[PDB]
Amino acid sequence: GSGVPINVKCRGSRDCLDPCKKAGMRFGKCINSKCHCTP
């Protein structure tokens, strides 16, 4: 719903932190091995 996919692969939600921040967002969740950022 509210999460925003970016085209970054992940093993776990830590992998999504730096990319989600660089994409303008607060942090990220790793969902089926892909980062979904929380705006």
Structure description:
This protein has 39 residues and is α+β, with helices and mostly antiparallel strands. The protein has a single domain (4-38), classed as Knottin, scorpion toxin-like (Defensin A-like, 2-Layer Sandwich), CATH 3.30.30. It contains one helix and three strands. A hairpin with a 2-residue loop joins strand 2 (27-31) and strand 3. It starts with a strand and ends with a strand.
SSE blueprint and pairings:
Layout: E1 4-9, H1 17-22, E2 27-31, E3 34-38
Antiparallel strand pairs: 1-3, 2-3
PDB class: toxin
Keywords: Knottins, Cystine knot
Assembly: monomeric
H/E order of the elements? EHEE
Question: Counting H and I runs of at least 4 residues, what is the number of helices?
Answer: 1
Structural class given helices, strands, pairing? Answer: alpha+beta
Sheet having the most strands: 3 strands, antiparallel
Query: Largest sheet, order of strands side by side?
Result: 1-3-2
Instruction: Give the overall silhouette.
Output: globular
Number of strands: 3
Rg for CA atoms: 8 Å
What is the CATH topology? Defensin A-like
CATH class: Alpha Beta
- Strand residue percentage: 35-45%
Distance between the termini: 12 Å
CATH superfamily: Knottin, scorpion toxin-like
> Roughly how much helix do the residues carry, as a percent range?
10-25%
CATH architect. name: 2-Layer Sandwich
Which oligomeric form is depicted?
A: monomer
- Number of separate structural domains: 1
PDB class: toxin
Keywords: Knottins, Cystine knot, Toxins, toxin
Assembly: monomeric
Entry title: Exploring Cystine Dense Peptide Space to Open a Unique Molecular Toolbox
